[PDB]
Design a protein around this ligand. Structure first.
Ligand code: RFN
Ligand code: ZN
Length: 299
């Protein structure tokens, strides 16, 4: 059978919140079967735990934020994308502050942490959610769609309307597996445009962001000395974000996601739209791993 997995060892990292600019200590720990990914605010008394589930997404302004009462865990998407990419079903994520550290702006440092801690297979069937029929959401010039597919395909289209793109809409599609996640997605960094600084300043956002942990674009060009990791790094990051936001469903999806200028808000609305359409999806397990729809790394 296709099994659930967790981490084999505890591992630690330090960084800063992209939006808060606050130093934060992170600890990843193994967790039991059927736990999912759970964030724990160990700086609070009492300690507050927030499951990383779509229903706990309370804010989606330039990040995905989990909320339980007055307690928040911000910017969960890049970590969650790495957990999804490596097939980590269950884990605890302890934080000393309200925001996951941004690291280098990509999921690469989280792939490092997960692979260095190692994986532990658990004796429980992995439950997948399979898309049976098309579901979509649309807010203005943004749209997000699920359609059936036997695997997990993440497609994205976005026109950034900036000179670095040479007037070309950015498009990419990834046939998801742990290997294609590592190869094609994991290292794509977050990004910002200087045209948006007044907006960010006014909302006290991106306080921890710079060329050290993000691609920064001025009126003409990418400011980062070494340029881009991928020619299509911007759209590949949008795919990284979608993988992390979609993992908040609580189960790996068997289907195709198509994003059209979509972001965190619409990603969460698509999950709520899908969940509510009870006949558009089903829960499945695999007794015979030879029919597995998605290839995950072995522990
Ligand atoms: C929502 C974004 C983007 C987050 N994000 C990153 C970087 C900056 C920034 C950094 C330095 C200078 C100016 C802006 C601002 C910001 O808001 C995402 O990556 N969320 O995970 S996105 C790429 O989808 O727009
Ligand atoms: Zn992102």
């Amino acid at each position: 059978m296709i099994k659930q997995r967790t981490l084999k060892n505890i591992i630690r990292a330090t960084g800063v919140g992209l939006h808060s600019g606050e130093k934060v200590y992170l600890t990843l720990k193994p967790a039991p079967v059927d736990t999912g990914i759970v964030f724990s605010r160990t700086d609070l008394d009492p300690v507050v735990e927030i499951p990383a589930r779509a229903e706990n997404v309370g804010e989606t302004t330039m990040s995905t934020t989990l909320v339980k009462g007055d307690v928040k865990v911000d910017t969960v998407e890049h970590l969650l994308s790495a957990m999804a990419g490596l097939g980590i079903d269950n884990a605890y994520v302890e934080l000393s502050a309200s925001e996951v550290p941004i690291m280098d702006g990509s999921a690469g440092p989280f792939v490092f942490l997960i692979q260095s801690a190692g994986l532990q297979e658990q004796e429980a069937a992995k439950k997948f959610i399979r898309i049976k029929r098309e579901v979509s959401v649309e807010e203005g010039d943004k749209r997000a769609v699920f359609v059936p597919f036997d695997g997990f395909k993440v497609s994205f289209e976005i026109d950034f309307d900036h000179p670095v793109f040479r007037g070309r809409t950015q498009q990419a599609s990834v046939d998801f597996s742990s290997t294609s996640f590592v190869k094609e997605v994991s290292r794509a960094r977050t990004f910002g445009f200087m045209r948006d600084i007044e907006y960010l300043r006014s909302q006290n956002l991106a306080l921890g962001g710079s060329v050290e942990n993000a691609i920064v674009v001025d009126e003409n060009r990418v400011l980062n000395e070494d340029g881009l990791r991928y020619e299509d790094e911007f759209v590949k990051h949008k795919i990284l974000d979608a993988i992390g936001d979609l993992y908040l469903l609580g189960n790996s999806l068997i289907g195709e996601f198509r994003g059209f200028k979509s972001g965190h808000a619409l990603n969460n609305q698509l999950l709520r739209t899908l969940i509510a359409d009870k006949d558009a999806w089903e829960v499945v397990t695999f007794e015979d791993a030879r029919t597995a729809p998605i290839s995950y790394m072995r522990p």
